[PDB]
Amino acid sequence: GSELSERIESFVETLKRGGGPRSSEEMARETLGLLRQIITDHRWSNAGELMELIRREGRRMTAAQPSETTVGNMVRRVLKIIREEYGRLHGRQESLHKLLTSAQLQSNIIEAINELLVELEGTMENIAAQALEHIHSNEVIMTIGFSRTVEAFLKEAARKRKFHVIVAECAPFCQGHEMAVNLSKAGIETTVMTDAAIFAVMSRVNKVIIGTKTILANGALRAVTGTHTLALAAKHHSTPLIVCAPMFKLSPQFPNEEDSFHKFVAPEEVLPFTEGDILEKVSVHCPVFDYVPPELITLFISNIGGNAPSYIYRLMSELYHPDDHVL
């Protein structure tokens, strides 16, 4: 269809040029809608043909912006759904047991995708409903950067409890200031600090609650810049660390399998152009994403509950297929 191609082009251009949609939840919903339209408004007979089409579209979308993994995760989830539906409609995991022991598909796939959207809708409330069991009165909670999930978590927690929140601005993109006003609009008695001071204050923090951008297979994290330092300080002081992360943010990739994991933007934010002559020799780097090893993570909180990092491999194995990590 002409409109299908138009929407695909608009989506890939928006992804590769700048931001949009604002929240990763909206991006995942738009990706799922586009994939649903691809499945419906296109011709295909065998499951292999549909898988090849989905693979080509996923390759294109991932090549549009590699640093954004939500589109790839949704594509892989759709591929896994297709595999499961075909397997249980035609016949009937890669474990040791398997080692020792050797027409109406489209409607089912559409229903599964609709179920996926339905459970995507209430993910934030599912995460925030269990905030009261992780916060005690007169606690000190430290946060980095800007994250709507953590914002809703803290707002839900503060309804029936009183505590203090310390937010470190994520320089240069000082988005933490929004927390500084937003939590203040809820009356949570928050404090603002520059992100050069974490360790200095870190000894007086009971718990750290942070969001994330991506979760890898081994249990690592792709977070905002400086989160590695915060996790290191937490490990030094042995303060428990909480990663409020929805289920759709589990990329089955691995940290060192590739590069461009960090995302580099114009060095204008770090060093303004008005410097002049010194810019002619000075090299400036402005990475906006940092890698957090799984050793420094104490707990993961998702729309399905709490988990340890050591269990992440299971969840990644329950949502994707090993033969789709290459895409």
Binding site: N108, I110, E111, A112, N114, E115, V118, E119, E121, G122, E125, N126, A129, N303, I304
Partner: protein
Amino acid sequence: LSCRFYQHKFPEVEDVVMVNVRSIAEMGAYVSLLEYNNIEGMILLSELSRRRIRSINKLIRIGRNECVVVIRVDKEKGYIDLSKRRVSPEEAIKCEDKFTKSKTVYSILRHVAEVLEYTKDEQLESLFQRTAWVFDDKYKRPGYGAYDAFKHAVSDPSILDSLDLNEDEREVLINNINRRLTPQAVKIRADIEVACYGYEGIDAVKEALRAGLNCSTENMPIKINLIAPPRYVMTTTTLERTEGLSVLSQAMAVIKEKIEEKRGVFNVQMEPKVV
């Protein structure tokens, strides 16, 4: 204040029905049957989805309405059991259309009751029994019958007058139906630059404009205005936008043919669109 939309009290089995979730239990999910005067209902956990689901909250979303079929009815114990696996998307669409039409009908009846200032709930129940459910019984098609009868009354007031409620109540109901079942408003606009830089430029332009405007039938007068020197805006404020678009396309084709015949210039600045 409020009552069941239909005279029938307990919906039959294998009937897709709207629900509103309220809470979550071990046996399943609690809902209110919104269109049956908010009677309590259950969705079994073993029927939420065809896939393997471990948590009810994955799809419950307390406070969000849903479309669930009915799998078992027990009028003696007041127990109704519902389902989500059986309902098809088409069934959900038609049930949603049913719910929207029933909501419109109930809004009309509630406005009539408020106008009558019938503070007695029994009076409102009798109003449901007499005014709207009469057409429901006559048409032998619940839901759609009331809306179709109200549309006919908005068209021909004979149906509304045929009711035996009252005189002032009939006037109030007619006023409510007119204010609610007659929201007609449309104005289709388009832009086209028609100009011939030839011998009889203004003459050919006027002739082409008159020929195009001659295609505007009654209740659809296509008025052409000179917003700019070379461009002209054609406006047709008429209902039935599906037919209005075709009429505008035919007029544009006629204008283009007339302009091309006299060796002139005709450009389609924009296709017809609502305002």
